[model samples]
Target: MTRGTTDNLIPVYASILAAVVVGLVAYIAFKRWNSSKQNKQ
Candidate 1:
Protein backbone atom coordinates (compact mmCIF):
# COMPACT_ATOMS: atom_id res chain seq x y z
CA MET A 1 0.00 0.00 0.00
CA THR A 2 1.00 3.59 -0.61
CA ARG A 3 -0.23 7.05 0.09
CA GLY A 4 0.94 10.41 -1.23
CA THR A 5 0.05 13.97 -0.38
CA THR A 6 1.12 17.52 -1.12
CA ASP A 7 -0.20 21.03 -0.45
CA ASN A 8 -0.37 24.59 -1.69
CA LEU A 9 2.55 25.52 0.52
CA ILE A 10 4.91 24.99 -2.38
CA PRO A 11 3.05 27.42 -4.61
CA VAL A 12 2.68 29.88 -1.78
CA TYR A 13 6.41 29.86 -1.07
CA ALA A 14 7.20 30.06 -4.77
CA SER A 15 5.09 33.15 -5.15
CA ILE A 16 6.75 34.76 -2.17
CA LEU A 17 10.21 33.82 -3.40
CA ALA A 18 9.40 35.09 -6.86
CA ALA A 19 8.25 38.40 -5.45
CA VAL A 20 11.40 38.74 -3.40
CA VAL A 21 13.72 37.75 -6.23
CA VAL A 22 11.97 40.12 -8.65
CA GLY A 23 12.72 43.04 -6.40
CA LEU A 24 16.19 41.72 -5.65
CA VAL A 25 16.94 41.60 -9.35
CA ALA A 26 15.95 45.23 -9.75
CA TYR A 27 18.20 46.35 -6.93
CA ILE A 28 21.16 44.56 -8.50
CA ALA A 29 20.43 46.23 -11.82
CA PHE A 30 20.37 49.63 -10.15
CA LYS A 31 23.83 48.93 -8.77
CA ARG A 32 25.13 49.21 -12.32
CA TRP A 33 23.52 52.60 -12.82
CA ASN A 34 25.04 53.91 -9.61
CA SER A 35 28.48 52.65 -10.69
CA SER A 36 28.50 55.17 -13.53
CA LYS A 37 26.74 58.00 -11.70
CA GLN A 38 28.80 57.88 -8.51
CA ASN A 39 31.62 55.52 -9.41
CA LYS A 40 30.10 52.93 -7.13
CA GLN A 41 31.49 49.51 -7.90
Candidate 2:
Protein backbone atom coordinates (compact mmCIF):
# COMPACT_ATOMS: atom_id res chain seq x y z
CA MET A 1 0.00 0.00 0.00
CA THR A 2 2.73 2.50 0.83
CA ARG A 3 4.73 1.69 -2.29
CA GLY A 4 1.70 2.07 -4.51
CA THR A 5 0.95 5.52 -3.12
CA THR A 6 4.52 6.65 -3.58
CA ASP A 7 4.61 5.39 -7.16
CA ASN A 8 1.48 7.30 -8.08
CA LEU A 9 2.66 10.50 -6.46
CA ILE A 10 6.03 10.36 -8.18
CA PRO A 11 4.64 11.06 -11.63
CA VAL A 12 2.45 13.85 -10.25
CA TYR A 13 5.40 15.50 -8.58
CA ALA A 14 7.60 15.08 -11.66
CA SER A 15 5.02 16.63 -13.95
CA ILE A 16 4.60 19.64 -11.69
CA LEU A 17 8.35 20.06 -11.48
CA ALA A 18 8.77 19.90 -15.26
CA ALA A 19 6.02 22.45 -15.77
CA VAL A 20 7.64 24.92 -13.39
CA VAL A 21 10.98 24.63 -15.18
CA VAL A 22 9.42 25.05 -18.58
CA GLY A 23 7.43 28.06 -17.41
CA LEU A 24 10.54 29.81 -16.14
CA VAL A 25 12.42 29.16 -19.35
CA ALA A 26 9.54 30.46 -21.44
CA TYR A 27 9.26 33.61 -19.32
CA ILE A 28 12.94 34.33 -19.61
CA ALA A 29 12.89 33.82 -23.35
CA PHE A 30 9.99 36.21 -23.71
CA LYS A 31 11.69 38.86 -21.65
CA ARG A 32 14.84 38.63 -23.72
CA TRP A 33 12.87 38.89 -26.95
CA ASN A 34 10.94 41.92 -25.73
CA SER A 35 14.11 43.66 -24.67
CA SER A 36 15.80 43.01 -27.97
CA LYS A 37 12.82 44.33 -29.87
CA GLN A 38 12.88 47.56 -27.91
CA ASN A 39 16.59 47.92 -28.42
CA LYS A 40 16.22 47.48 -32.18
CA GLN A 41 14.09 50.62 -32.47
Candidate 3:
Protein backbone atom coordinates (compact mmCIF):
# COMPACT_ATOMS: atom_id res chain seq x y z
CA MET A 1 0.00 0.00 0.00
CA THR A 2 1.07 3.59 -0.56
CA ARG A 3 2.31 5.23 2.59
CA GLY A 4 3.57 8.49 3.98
CA THR A 5 7.21 9.04 3.03
CA THR A 6 10.07 11.52 2.88
CA ASP A 7 9.62 12.03 -0.84
CA ASN A 8 7.36 15.01 -0.27
CA LEU A 9 9.42 16.48 2.54
CA ILE A 10 12.54 17.48 0.57
CA PRO A 11 10.68 19.80 -1.77
CA VAL A 12 8.66 21.28 1.04
CA TYR A 13 11.74 22.09 3.07
CA ALA A 14 13.57 23.41 0.05
CA SER A 15 10.74 25.76 -0.75
CA ILE A 16 10.69 27.08 2.80
CA LEU A 17 14.44 27.70 2.74
CA ALA A 18 14.25 29.43 -0.62
CA ALA A 19 11.46 31.72 0.54
CA VAL A 20 13.42 32.74 3.61
CA VAL A 21 16.42 33.64 1.48
CA VAL A 22 14.37 35.72 -0.92
CA GLY A 23 12.69 37.53 1.94
CA LEU A 24 15.99 38.43 3.55
CA VAL A 25 17.39 39.73 0.28
CA ALA A 26 14.35 41.88 -0.37
CA TYR A 27 14.47 43.28 3.15
CA ILE A 28 18.13 44.22 2.92
CA ALA A 29 17.67 45.90 -0.46
CA PHE A 30 14.71 47.87 0.83
CA LYS A 31 16.69 49.07 3.82
CA ARG A 32 19.58 50.12 1.64
CA TRP A 33 17.29 52.06 -0.66
CA ASN A 34 15.77 53.95 2.22
CA SER A 35 19.15 54.73 3.69
CA SER A 36 20.39 56.03 0.37
CA LYS A 37 17.32 58.21 -0.03
CA GLN A 38 17.87 59.74 3.38
CA ASN A 39 21.47 60.40 2.56
CA LYS A 40 20.42 62.25 -0.57
CA GLN A 41 18.17 64.58 1.41
Candidate 4:
Protein backbone atom coordinates (compact mmCIF):
# COMPACT_ATOMS: atom_id res chain seq x y z
CA MET A 1 0.00 0.00 0.00
CA THR A 2 3.00 2.21 0.23
CA ARG A 3 3.13 4.32 -2.90
CA GLY A 4 6.61 5.74 -2.54
CA THR A 5 8.78 8.10 -0.61
CA THR A 6 8.98 10.55 -3.46
CA ASP A 7 7.75 14.14 -3.49
CA ASN A 8 4.61 13.20 -5.41
CA LEU A 9 3.15 10.92 -2.77
CA ILE A 10 0.04 10.55 -0.68
CA PRO A 11 0.38 10.49 3.08
CA VAL A 12 -2.82 8.49 3.71
CA TYR A 13 -4.66 11.61 4.84
CA ALA A 14 -8.01 10.36 3.63
CA SER A 15 -8.22 7.62 6.26
CA ILE A 16 -7.56 10.14 9.01
CA LEU A 17 -9.86 12.70 7.42
CA ALA A 18 -12.68 10.21 7.14
CA ALA A 19 -12.19 9.07 10.69
CA VAL A 20 -12.34 12.67 11.86
CA VAL A 21 -15.54 13.27 9.97
CA VAL A 22 -17.16 10.15 11.38
CA GLY A 23 -16.21 11.09 14.91
CA LEU A 24 -17.39 14.65 14.41
CA VAL A 25 -20.78 13.47 13.26
CA ALA A 26 -21.03 11.17 16.22
CA TYR A 27 -20.08 13.99 18.55
CA ILE A 28 -22.69 16.30 17.05
CA ALA A 29 -25.36 13.66 17.42
CA PHE A 30 -24.29 12.99 20.96
CA LYS A 31 -24.55 16.69 21.82
CA ARG A 32 -28.02 16.94 20.35
CA TRP A 33 -29.16 13.84 22.18
CA ASN A 34 -27.91 15.25 25.46
CA SER A 35 -29.77 18.48 24.88
CA SER A 36 -33.00 16.65 24.20
CA LYS A 37 -32.53 14.30 27.12
CA GLN A 38 -34.13 16.55 29.76
CA ASN A 39 -36.56 18.66 27.81
CA LYS A 40 -39.72 18.70 29.87
CA GLN A 41 -40.93 22.14 28.84
Candidate 5:
Protein backbone atom coordinates (compact mmCIF):
# COMPACT_ATOMS: atom_id res chain seq x y z
CA MET A 1 0.00 0.00 0.00
CA THR A 2 3.06 2.22 0.16
CA ARG A 3 3.85 4.62 -2.69
CA GLY A 4 7.47 3.56 -2.91
CA THR A 5 6.69 0.74 -5.30
CA THR A 6 5.73 1.52 -8.89
CA ASP A 7 2.53 -0.45 -8.73
CA ASN A 8 1.35 1.37 -5.63
CA LEU A 9 2.59 4.82 -6.59
CA ILE A 10 -0.03 5.51 -9.26
CA PRO A 11 -2.81 4.15 -7.12
CA VAL A 12 -1.66 6.19 -4.16
CA TYR A 13 -1.55 9.36 -6.20
CA ALA A 14 -4.90 8.62 -7.76
CA SER A 15 -6.44 8.08 -4.37
CA ILE A 16 -5.05 11.35 -3.07
CA LEU A 17 -6.18 13.29 -6.13
CA ALA A 18 -9.62 11.72 -5.99
CA ALA A 19 -10.03 12.72 -2.39
CA VAL A 20 -9.09 16.31 -3.18
CA VAL A 21 -11.50 16.46 -6.10
CA VAL A 22 -14.32 15.03 -4.03
CA GLY A 23 -13.69 17.52 -1.26
CA LEU A 24 -13.75 20.44 -3.68
CA VAL A 25 -16.89 19.19 -5.36
CA ALA A 26 -18.65 18.77 -2.05
CA TYR A 27 -17.66 22.25 -0.91
CA ILE A 28 -18.80 23.83 -4.17
CA ALA A 29 -22.09 21.96 -4.13
CA PHE A 30 -22.78 22.98 -0.56
CA LYS A 31 -22.14 26.62 -1.33
CA ARG A 32 -24.26 26.56 -4.45
CA TRP A 33 -27.12 24.83 -2.68
CA ASN A 34 -27.07 27.37 0.14
CA SER A 35 -26.95 30.31 -2.23
CA SER A 36 -29.82 28.99 -4.29
CA LYS A 37 -31.89 28.36 -1.23
CA GLN A 38 -31.26 31.86 0.06
CA ASN A 39 -32.21 33.39 -3.28
CA LYS A 40 -35.59 31.69 -3.18
CA GLN A 41 -36.52 33.36 0.11
Candidate 6:
Protein backbone atom coordinates (compact mmCIF):
# COMPACT_ATOMS: atom_id res chain seq x y z
CA MET A 1 0.00 0.00 0.00
CA THR A 2 2.85 2.44 0.69
CA ARG A 3 4.82 1.54 -2.39
CA GLY A 4 3.60 4.33 -4.66
CA THR A 5 3.67 7.11 -2.09
CA THR A 6 7.34 7.95 -2.52
CA ASP A 7 6.98 8.31 -6.27
CA ASN A 8 5.01 11.53 -5.89
CA LEU A 9 7.84 13.45 -4.29
CA ILE A 10 10.22 12.74 -7.16
CA PRO A 11 8.58 15.23 -9.50
CA VAL A 12 8.49 17.91 -6.81
CA TYR A 13 12.19 17.56 -6.15
CA ALA A 14 12.99 17.44 -9.86
CA SER A 15 10.97 20.57 -10.62
CA ILE A 16 12.71 22.54 -7.89
CA LEU A 17 16.10 21.41 -9.08
CA ALA A 18 15.25 22.35 -12.66
CA ALA A 19 14.09 25.80 -11.63
CA VAL A 20 17.34 26.45 -9.79
CA VAL A 21 19.45 25.39 -12.75
CA VAL A 22 17.48 27.53 -15.19
CA GLY A 23 17.72 30.53 -12.91
CA LEU A 24 21.48 30.19 -12.64
CA VAL A 25 21.88 29.94 -16.42
CA ALA A 26 19.67 32.97 -17.03
CA TYR A 27 21.61 35.05 -14.52
CA ILE A 28 24.90 34.16 -16.15
CA ALA A 29 23.59 35.00 -19.60
CA PHE A 30 22.30 38.35 -18.44
CA LYS A 31 25.64 39.29 -16.92
CA ARG A 32 27.47 38.29 -20.06
CA TRP A 33 25.14 40.33 -22.23
CA ASN A 34 25.68 43.41 -20.09
CA SER A 35 29.46 43.06 -20.26
CA SER A 36 29.36 42.63 -24.00
CA LYS A 37 27.25 45.71 -24.41
CA GLN A 38 29.67 47.74 -22.33
CA ASN A 39 32.58 46.49 -24.40
CA LYS A 40 30.80 47.42 -27.61
CA GLN A 41 30.27 50.99 -26.44
lDDT values, one for every candidate: 0.76, 0.81, 0.81, 0.73, 0.80, 0.81
C-alpha root-mean-square deviation, candidate 1 = 5.8
lDDT by residue (tens digit), candidate 1, 1-41: 54345565677789999989988988887976877766544
**Higher TM-score: candidate 1 or 4?**
1
* TM-score against truth, every candidate: 0.51, 0.61, 0.58, 0.49, 0.61, 0.61
lDDT of 3 by residue, 1-41 (tens): 66568777788889999999989988987878986665542
**Which runs in model 3 stand beyond 4 Å of their true positions?**
1-6, 37-41
Worst 10 residues of 4 by lDDT: 2-11
Instruction: Give, for candidate 2, the lowest lDDT window spanning 10 residues.
Output: 32-41
Q: Model 1 off-target regions past 4 Å? A: 1-4, 34-41
Report the Cα lDDT for candidate 2: 0.81
- Which lDDT tens digits does candidate 4 get at residues 1-41? 76667654344676778889999998987887887676543
Winner on lDDT between 5 and 6 is 6
25: Cα error in model 5, Å: 1.0
Tens-digit per-residue lDDT, 1-41, candidate 6:
56456768798889999999989988987878987665542
List pairs with backbone clashes in candidate 2.
Answer: none
Pitting candidate 1 against candidate 3, the one with the higher TM-score is 3
